[PDB]
Amino acid sequence: QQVIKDLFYVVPLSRNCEKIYKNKTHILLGISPFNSKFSQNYIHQLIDWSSKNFKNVTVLLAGDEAKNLLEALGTPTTKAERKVRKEIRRHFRFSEEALRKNGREIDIYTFSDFKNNKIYNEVYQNVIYYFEKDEKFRKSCLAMSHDALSSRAKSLNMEDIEITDNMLFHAVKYVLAELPFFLSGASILGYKESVLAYHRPWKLGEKIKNSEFYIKMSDNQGYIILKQIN
């Protein structure tokens, strides 16, 4: 189906991201938790299009710190942990169905699955270091945290809530834990190169690509925005 091959229009973060995308070596599909965009049908579209276009496909699901997003928006830890487990199981089920339909390996991980991986741990340590020591990087990470909480506030219908600093610093643990895959997902997983793919721009990535921090993306890592057009 040429409809499937053209399901998405790709917008690269940088010209280097475009080259990695055009090499079609590997795509990492970021599935955000507690986001109504990621229905069964949409996850199938992502994987169907990825399977026609890329040599290798991997799905990234949220790890343990997804509970922080709920704990910030008024969920006690017990309910938050159960809601995360349920959400990850559903994301896995839909992703596995579509990978299987395409004759693909069931290559699905959470960002918590790499605590014994030296690349993940060392990039994570770098992210934590500059979060503590570079106010500019810290501010950008806290803005990613604000974005994640604002979206779910609207999504769990709670837009009257003030987003406090304590909310931001609790939720930024999610941002810091996911960021190594934005920076170095190919090297963490073991592919020669990769693009992480998502449906929204990554403003911090634009700054990283503008050489604004000592935090850098790996040379073999790109980021693409997936749009759908008529």
* Burial label, 72 (beta-carbon count in 10 A; 0-12, 13-18, 19+): buried
* Burial label, 166 (beta-carbon count in 10 A; 0-12, 13-18, 19+): exposed
Task: Name 93's Cβ contacts closer than 8 Å, sequence gap at least 6.
Answer: none
Neighbours of 136 (CB within 10 A): 11
Method: X-ray
Query: Cα–Cα distance between 86 and 93 in angstroms, integer?
Result: 11
What is the DSSP secondary structure assignment for residue 35, as one 8-state letter? Answer: -
Helix axes 135-155, 118-133, angle to 10 degrees: 100
Which of these, 107, 83, 91, lies nearest to 27 by C-alpha position? 107
Q: Using CA atoms in the order 164, 165, 170, 172, what is the torsion angle rounded to 10 degrees?
A: 110
Neighbours of 170 (CB within 10 A): 18
Query: Cα–Cα distance between 230 and 221 in angstroms, integer?
Result: 29
Q: Is 117 within 8 Å of 188 (Cβ atoms)?
A: yes
The terminus-to-terminus CA distance of the chain in angstroms comes to 16
Resolution in A: 1.8
Return the SS3 of 57.
strand
Which of these, 203, 201, 195, 202, lies nearest to 227 by C-alpha position? 201
Q: Enter the tokens of residue 72.
A: 């910030």
Q: Annotated active-site positions, please? A: 32
Beta-bridge partners for 195: 27, 222
Alpha carbon 89 to its chain's center: 17
Which of these, 179, 165, 175, 161, lies nearest to 75 by C-alpha position? 161
Q: Enter the tokens of residue 50.
A: 């990825």
- What is the C-alpha radius of gyration for the chain, rounded to an integer number of angstroms? 17
Q: Enter the tokens of residue 6.
A: 């053209």
Which of these, 8, 1, 3, lies nearest to 27 by C-alpha position? 8
Q: Is 42 within 8 Å of 86 (Cβ atoms)?
A: no
Which of these, 197, 189, 180, lies nearest to 38 by C-alpha position? 197
Which of these, 157, 40, 180, 194, lies nearest to 110 by C-alpha position? 180
160 phi and psi, to 5 degrees? -80, -10
Query: Cα–Cα distance between 6 and 151 in angstroms, integer?
Result: 28
The label of the residue with tokens 């749009």 reads 227
The label of the residue with tokens 């930024």 reads 172
Which of these, 76, 36, 37, 59, lies nearest to 156 by C-alpha position? 36
Query: Cα–Cα distance between 222 and 206 in angstroms, integer?
Result: 11
Query: Any idea where the domains of the chain sit in the sequence?
Result: 1-230
What is the H or E stretch that residue 11 is in?
Answer: strand 9-12
Strand pairing class (9-12; 221-227): antiparallel
